[PDB]
Each structure stands twice: as C-alpha cells, then as structure tokens.
Design a protein around this ligand. Sequence first.
Ligand SMILES: [Zn+2]
Length: 29
Amino acid sequence: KPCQCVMCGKAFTQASSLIAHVRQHTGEK
Ligand SMILES: [Zn+2]
C-alpha cells in the first residue's frame, strides 16, 4: 500500500521502498 514517510511526508507507490526511505531519518542499522 502507498504510504508516506511519516518523517518528511514523502509518499511512495511502493510501501517497502517507503520503509527504506523512512529509515533514513531514523538512522542506520
Ligand atoms: Zn523521508
């Protein structure tokens, strides 16, 4: 499901690509 990077508001048509993106504001592993 298309979701939004809760951090910056960037939305993507692919949820998993989103998750990778949203992790960027959170931090590395
Ligand atoms: Zn973002």
